[PDB]
Amino acid sequence: QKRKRQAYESNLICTRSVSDDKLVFVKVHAPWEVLCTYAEIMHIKLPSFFNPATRSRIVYRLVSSGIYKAAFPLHDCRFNYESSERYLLYREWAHPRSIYKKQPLDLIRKYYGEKIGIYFAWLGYYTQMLLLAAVVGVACFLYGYLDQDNCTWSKEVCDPDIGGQILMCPQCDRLCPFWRLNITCESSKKLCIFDSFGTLIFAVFMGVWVTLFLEFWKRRQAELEFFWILLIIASVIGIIVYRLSVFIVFSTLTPQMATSITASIISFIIIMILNTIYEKVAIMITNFELPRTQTDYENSLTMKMFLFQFVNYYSSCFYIAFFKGKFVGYPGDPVYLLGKYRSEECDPGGCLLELTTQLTIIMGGKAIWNNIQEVLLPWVMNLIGRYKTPRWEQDYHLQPMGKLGLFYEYLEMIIQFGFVTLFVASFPLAPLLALVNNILEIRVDAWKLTTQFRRMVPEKAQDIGAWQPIMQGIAILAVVTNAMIIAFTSDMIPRLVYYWSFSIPPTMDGYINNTLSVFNITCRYRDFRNPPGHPQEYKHNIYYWHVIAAKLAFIIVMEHIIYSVKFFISYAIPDVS
């Protein structure tokens, strides 16, 4: 026990704490010749001469068994008062009062290390790219807002004659009664913002913006040089079925917004606690496997953890986008999934607004609650530690960062990126919310890393790591996902077909009465079905196949055009300075 530690200390050669007599901490420094020897064995760069991050790396499992209590570097100074580097970049960068200043990226790679430097460089560059995407999203938001007097469909669903005379079918078995449509008017008014031509121009822009983000980040990186799959499928089913359950336990502006916000909040609570669960089961799964190296361990953990997180966070959104209300048929013979399991018909405006509210609640709530957790949990852990003098004694009573470190940090921003990219065709303010989150996110990551956490050992990484193929896969998936959101989720394509193709005798006015289908009780539900009385009644009509062929042709045209533009831009940008 103590013999192993004494022999290891004698090999390393080859004070106790004033507050706790049982703990003893040994100072570790290197001589000049030994530093030059370790700097020859590890080929460091050249122009007191060795930097403190370089010294702490060159000086850098036995503590995993519990023999050694703690091994760490030491901070330079207290942040609250000057001794003095930590005080400096706390005073001008890490403080929330210095929210507007530029990041001292050379100072952050000086003090913390190039993985922390590359995370904060990626975070700041993400913020600057999100500023461009956010002002274009504000431009398309103004395009939707100022043309609210020209959206003919919202003005005729808000008018009582065209909108109120619908009396559309119930989406629900026990009474849930059939209703005049003008009550969705206050939900439809903002819908003129959320699927107009402005958000289509924004989505086609956002494909290009993701491409520019990736290529100029490649340039900035160039400058700055089997049971678990079955469990994932069970998770895929689980998030959808509790999305249904939270909508049901709610079901037993104001009414629709209360519905969407309340169900989104309670589902988001389940999302967070199931996220902690998924952290634990994925770490148990990758510990059941034997990984040979820590890097292969964290790559496998990155893939499995991100797949569980992808499933957990976006499966509700994918249900609302592509599965909710998409497979329901006519009110005669509704689709009972397993018997007595009638699926949820959507509102006639579409499930885009419900997707929008769920997106902004999950995104902004993960932002708010994750920053609250990132502040408070190390702070309250240090507080209950302090409720139970030398420098290293002060630096001892800090929550250690962990073996992974910045991993979860990257993870949450990648999840934020999946809201910025995969669902950007729903609401254009996703880069704005991401920007206002990221401006504080640099400060909260900075502040907890400076104040609350022990100093992580500096070590260089040439990129973000295994998150880069994840981001490229998210980028390729974003084109398909935005195409299915504009085609399948929103209703922009049916009114596009109504204006361009059926103002003709075989304008935009008269769209709402001409879209829906009348239903015999043996009301006008939202579907394109040949009507009681037509020879092919309740089968899909000519107009269903016209609109769905325009949907599929839009998916093909938009995907091929955007993928060729992404190819032309990745081929045209030299990817170097």
Ligand X SMILES: CCCCCCCCCC(=O)OC[C@@H](COP(=O)(O)OCC[N+](C)(C)C)OC(=O)CCCCCCCCC
The residues binding a copy of itself (CB under 8 A) are 480, 506, 536, 539, 541-542, 545-546, 548-549, 552-553, 555-556, 560
Q: Tokens 């254009």 correspond to what residue?
A: 428
Our finding on whether 184 is near Ca ion (CB under 5 A) is no
Nearer to Ca ion, 335 or 377 (CB): 377
**Minimum distance of a copy of itself from residue 227's CB (angstroms):** 19
Which residues from 416-475 bind Ca ion, rule CB under 5 A? 445
Burial class (CB in 10 A: 0-12, 13-18, 19+), 118: buried
Residue 113 found at the interface with ligand X (CB under 6 A): no
Position of tokens 């274009």?
136
Q: Which of 145, 322, 379, 408 binds ligand X (CB under 6 A)?
A: 322
Tell me: does residue 401 bind Ca ion (CB under 5 A): no
Binding residue for ligand X, selected from 162, 200, 474, 484, defined by CB under 6 A: 484
* Residue 542: contacted member of a copy of itself, Ca ion, ligand X, none (CB under 5 to 8 Å, by partner type): a copy of itself
Kindly state the smallest distance separating residue 315's Cβ from a copy of itself, in Å: 18
| Calculated CA dihedral for residues 383, 385, 386, 387, nearest 10 degrees | 90
SS3 104: coil
Query: Quick one: tokens of 312?
Result: 């957990």
Stretch that binds Ca ion, among 110-118, 190-198, 407-415, 537-545 (CB under 5 A): 407-415
- Smaller CB separation from ligand X, 117 or 325: 325
Mapping DSSP to helix (H, G, I), strand (E, B) and coil, where does residue 542 land?
helix
| Binder of residue 370, out of a copy of itself, ligand X, Ca ion, none (CB less than 5 to 8 A by kind) | Ca ion
Query: Residue 342: beta bridge partners?
Result: 336
CB of 56 to ligand X, least distance (A): 45
Among 125, 247, 314, 488, binds ligand X (CB under 6 A): 488
**How far is the CA of 10 from the CAs of 14, 80, 501, in angstroms?**
6, 38, 85
**Residue 529 has which token pair?**
């079905």
Is position 92 annotated in a ligand binding site? no
| 553 is a contact residue toward ligand X (CB under 6 A) | yes
Determine whether the annotation assigns residue 345 to a binding site: no
Gap between the Cα atoms of 528 and 540, Å rounded? 6
- 445 interacts with, out of ligand X, Ca ion, a copy of itself, none, CB within 5 to 8 A per kind: Ca ion
Residue 322 touches which member of a copy of itself, Ca ion, ligand X, none, C-beta under 5-8 Å by kind: ligand X
Smallest distance from Ca ion to CB 305, Å = 16
Residue from 26, 99, 556, 568 touching ligand X (CB under 6 A): that is 556
Of a copy of itself, Ca ion, ligand X, none, which one sits near residue 481, judging by CB under 5 to 8 A according to partner kind? ligand X
Place of tokens 């034997």: 290
Candidates 409, 443, 526, 529: give the one binding Ca ion (CB under 5 A): 409
Contact 44, 54 (CB under 8 A): yes
Spatial CB neighbours of 275, under 8 Å, sequence gap ≥ 6? 309, 312, 313
Site for ligand X in 531-550 (CB under 6 A): 548
Question: Toward ligand X, which CB reaches closer, 71 or 557?
Answer: 557
Residues 557, 567: contact at Cβ < 8 Å?
A: no
Task: Give the one residue of 192, 495, 527, 538 binding ligand X; rule: CB under 6 A.
Answer: 527
| Residue 247 and residue 262 in contact, taking contact as beta carbons nearer than 8 Å | no
List C-alpha distances in Å: 257 to 268, 379, 388.
16, 35, 47
Nearer to a copy of itself, 192 or 496 (CB): 496
Asked if residue 517 lies in contact with residue 330, where contact means CB atoms within 8 angstroms, the answer is: yes
351/81 Cα distance (integer angstroms): 54
Between residues 131 and 466, which has the closer beta carbon with respect to a copy of itself? 466
Q: How far is CA 459 from CA 41, 120, 257, 310, 418, in A?
A: 16, 14, 48, 28, 28
Whole-number Cα distances in Å, 181 to 162, 313, 524: 9, 32, 10
Whether the Cβ atoms of residue 419 and residue 359 lie closer than 8 Å to each other: yes
Using CB positions, name the residue nearest to Ca ion.
Answer: 370
d(CA 255, CA 242): 21
Question: Is there a binding annotation on residue 409?
Answer: yes
For 496, residues 6+ apart whose C-beta sits below 8 A from its C-beta are 550
Question: What pairs with residue 272 in β-bridges?
Answer: none
Give me the 516-545 binding string for Ca ion, x by CB under 5 A, dash otherwise. Answer: ------------------------------
174: its two tokens: 């026990």
Regarding 560 and contact with ligand X (CB under 6 A), the answer is: yes
434 binds ligand X, rule: CB under 6 A: no
What is each CA distance from 90 to 98, 327, 376, in whole angstroms? 9, 55, 18
Choose the contact partner of 536 out of a copy of itself, ligand X, Ca ion, none; CB within 5 to 8 A by kind.
a copy of itself
Task: Choose, by CB under 5 A, the member of 309, 312, 316, 370 that binds Ca ion.
Answer: 370
Q: Does 144 bind ligand X (CB under 6 A)?
A: no
Asked if 325 touches ligand X (CB under 6 A), the answer is yes
Residues binding Ca ion: number (CB under 5 A): 4
Query: For residues 77 and 548, which CB has a smaller minimum distance to a copy of itself in the complex?
Result: 548
Best CA proximity match to 524, nearest among 157, 180, 158: 180
Do the Cβ atoms of 420 and 130 come closer than 8 Å? yes
With CB under 5 to 8 Å by kind, the binding choice for 506 among a copy of itself, Ca ion, ligand X, none is: a copy of itself
Annotated binding site for Ca(2+): 374, 409, 412
The residues of the shown chain that bind ligand X, judged by CB under 6 A, are 322, 325-326, 328, 480-481, 484, 488, 526-527, 548, 553, 556-557, 560
Q: Where on the chain is the footprint of Ca ion (CB under 5 A)?
A: 370-371, 409, 445
